[PDB]
Amino acid sequence: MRVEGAIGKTPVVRLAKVVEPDMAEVWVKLEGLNPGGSIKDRPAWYMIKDAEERGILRPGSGQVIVEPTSGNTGIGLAMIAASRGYRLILTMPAQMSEERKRVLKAFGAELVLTDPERRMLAAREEALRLKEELGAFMPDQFKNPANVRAHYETTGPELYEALEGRIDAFVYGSGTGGTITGVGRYLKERIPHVKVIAVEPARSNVLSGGKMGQHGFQGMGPGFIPENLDLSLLDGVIQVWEEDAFPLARRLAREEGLFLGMSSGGIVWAALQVARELGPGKRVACISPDGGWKYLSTPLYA
Template sequence: MVKIVSSVAELIGDTPIIKLSSVVPEGFADVYLKLEAFNVGGSVKDRIALNMIETAEEDGILKPGDTIVEPTSGNTGVGLAMLAAAKGYKSVFVMPDTMSIERRLLLSAYGAELVLTPGAEGMPAAIAKAREIAAQPGHFLPLQFENPANPAIHETTTGPEIIAAFGGVGPDAFLSAVGTGGTITGVGRALRKANPAVGIYALEPSESAVLSGGQKGPHKIQGIGTGFIPQVLDTAVFDGVFQVSSEEAFAMTRRLAKEEGILVGISSGAAVAGAIALAGQLGAGKSVVTIAPDNGERYLSTPVFQN
């Protein structure tokens, strides 16, 4: 039944889950992909954008006429810009200049101001610049990397949605590509409450394997592998870490479009590649769920689809 809503905020959450077929080898566990592009703003980050804003409003930190400032690799900025426009706030976003042109254009379309920092300096440079801008009066810095409202919304919405889809118990395993760490932290906590035996696994770029104790480095998987361990990431929630190279992520992203008819972003390709590796370890009869943070239309100008 079609519902009528009064705000874009009401169109966030309850995203579908699809069982993959063609890209998963025979004899592997079943792999399921939660399609977060079905959120109204087009990504998983709509969830945290809404919760960070509404929590700040309730706490009296964000007031009418204020400006929202956030360092972002793109999707959180898009979610915040969308909601800022809907709620009447101004917005400024700081982003590494290596992020896709589609993300920049989306932010501008919502009326946001965009500040670019050197891509070689990664997210730490964007965070520092955002803090500088947000120091002005009337500016609010949600700071997704440190804000507890980030993992909290995944614990209360994303995780329970997965649990409900799997009969109230949840899948055998869950894998999430890690950017801020909010998704794996929140979903992991929710899944473990429903089933203490569930396996929770993080995924990171092999070129920047910080979670595995390695060194940060350049990679091409936009949205994950920040090069540091974010404050909101609870490393105790996951049982292990998988690594995927940028080229492996690119290859799976292309395969999902051409073999499954699912056009998703590069971090989704990375997540599916990791989930299939995990599915191979678990074997037939088991289930693995992973997250597709956004869709592929935000990456059409990038090398992943320039072939």
């Protein structure tokens, strides 16, 4: 078996200290326990596997893959490209942290640093230029249906099975939209009453009808509505503040032994609010995108 085969089948834990008696149960699926360190291992593998199935790629070919990202998707893609023999090029703003750059380069990914003032725009443009110039494959994480399918076929079934089909609400901090759409659809097809609640930063609350903005929940809240997000599935949207989520993330670590990432703090905070609304006999399920290992130099744990 290769590393791609080590992706998935992550555990789900029930919170016991940060919750209160008047709350529904709160379960958290730990996606940080993936070989790539995050939930992105799933869509990264699925988008590449889907490309191989469609004949766009053939493993061990040295074919070029390009994607504008330096986040978890970049790490997941780098891991898979290293394992399956593809040349990966990732575009990203020049202001990227040395830490992240080191992880990506460790996997052999080639990095192209773009205009720091043009943020994501310059990164997207360079990726498109390379795709055109090299005839490369671009996963296109925000609109590739294979992203959603990864969660519809693995993440969803796993969560459903682990919780024995008993879930009253599913809460998630949306990024590409793949997870909430894939898991949400899978759950709603089986649980008539289940509620699917999206979580987004109050500082970049576009799903709530607000405006995009800079925020600290790395990995979620892209500032736009991605094609992979099926709004028709949503039963609500909860806005979260770092001021509330970071202290909670620290409590999770000190009280539950759960050392999670920045987005996890926001997601769990939201899950607690939903748990209080539903009450004692209910069950709220949510997912922790990644662990705290990559954020020791951030205000979350610094």
